[model samples]
Target: EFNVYWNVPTFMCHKYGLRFEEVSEKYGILQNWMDKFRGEEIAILYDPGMFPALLKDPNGNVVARNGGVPQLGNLTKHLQVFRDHLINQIPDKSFPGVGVIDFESWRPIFRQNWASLQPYKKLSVEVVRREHPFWDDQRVEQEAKRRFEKYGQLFMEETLKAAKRMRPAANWGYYAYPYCYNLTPNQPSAQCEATTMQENDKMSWLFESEDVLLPSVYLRWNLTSGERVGLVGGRVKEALRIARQMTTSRKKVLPYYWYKYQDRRDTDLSRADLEATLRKITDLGADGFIIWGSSDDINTKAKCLQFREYLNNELGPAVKRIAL
Candidate 1:
């Protein structure tokens, strides 16, 4: 919710030699907003990329081959103090989640740290999941469920030892999509799962081990041609179905936004054009969206705003009903 307009303010911190809140103060959408839209929950959406715990021999390098056992093995420390300071800054937990592993990783550390601490932990603030390639249709639902769960439970089995000290109430989930962001309008959920579900079928792990989920409905980029598309209703709806199968208590939207106009590809779309485009997208299947946009242009800003507009406009109840 914080990154609306130009999404990468936190990311741009490195360029400006700023860390965390400094970026939010200077470049955050919150700073440049016309008004708050539902106080729509802001967060660091931060990613603590490759740390010693992950890359070192014991859990790091060896994991490359097993899931390399992600969906469950993701974990961290000085960072402990850093998180402590961060929690102090985030009053009333305005942001829903915390740091993510830079790599395609969830987090075991969240649960562990939570269990280890109390009112001073970032544990429940964030959720995690592993959306691996193995979730595809090649494997039957049964076997797919088998190896997937075996690996996940193994990760959790070990993580549980870690998670137990953590919390019986710890939450976790994954960032996922229909593989290519490509799906049929009338496609059955199972059919969609086959071509795209490889990563989706793993939802059971989230339900069994965790209490939350994040469906990555990034409609910004097209994988094959690098073209950008509009109207994410089908994809978002399909993603919801996948989450529904697993049946999560909390499901949020993690989408993308961009304003790079040079390529006219997936990354670039003008501000005005974005309004016309998303007018359609917002109307379709939707709900709580945490944007992951790139670039610092007005177009990127507009794309983010259009959705919020739908969320705020009272007359457009059809669109407003599903949007968050």
Candidate 2:
């Protein structure tokens, strides 16, 4: 029954390799890919709408980063332009929901990553401003005054705006990448000033309003010391917590746990690692899972095929009954 969906791509694409520089390089592959594989895809096609911060020219020059040098103005307008461009590339919305950015591979309407809080510098006189009225820049930028405040409000504000602006309605999947300390969900972000719950509280605003959450697990990777941390037990609670948050949330939760069974180093190349990670995402309340990173090189399929065969063999048939 499901061979149609799971059979297409060996794993999700876009990838961290150098080729992910410009949309022109990607549009053909991705638009067709979504045309083909999104049936069993994750979040909103891992969109890279024409935002300036991460923008690059054909040669892969990062002309801008972090909302662009001057900080992108009228971001929604630019996003709409990119949004429409993507739709034009793939006209028929065969998929259930269009991503106003359901997942967080990259980009946002007024999208930004996170903060040290020091703010009120004013990227634009008219474009970006704190909702709160303040005299000094100190309060807006202070960690004590605001938690998880890295201009996250833009995503909360803009994604829904884009959803209304576009077509063929469905849920948006806002990605909560490595949401907390020790890479757990529903917990405080070590990177941000807010506690785990505090960081997620900001995210909840987005998730509650959107179709789903793409909480990235990135389960297997080397630490600063090059030690591998592929233990499934560490991440299980985060998924469960994400599940719990949905229950307490205003909008229903439809989460897709983003997994990268093999990092660039392939620190975790084992049947046990694959099964444990997939099983945890399934056992937890995730609606599905996305194989965010992996090599399709049949040449290296010794380890890669181990992953490939497992997903094709085990994940294919039981996914509907388990994770979905």
| Angstrom error at residue 108, model 1 | 15
Alpha-carbon RMSD of each model: 12.6, 9.1
Instruction: Tell me the tens digit of each residue's lDDT in model 2 across 56-87.
Output: 58997745443542233356665666577556
Q: What is the alpha-carbon lDDT for the whole of candidate 1?
A: 0.35
Q: Per-residue lDDT of 4-58 in model 1, one digit per residue for the tens?
A: 3223443333243322342234323332122222122333323322222222375
Instruction: Estimate TM-scores for all models.
Output: 0.44, 0.57
Candidate-wise lDDT, in order: 0.35, 0.41
Best by TM-score: 2
Error of 1 at 128 (Å): 28
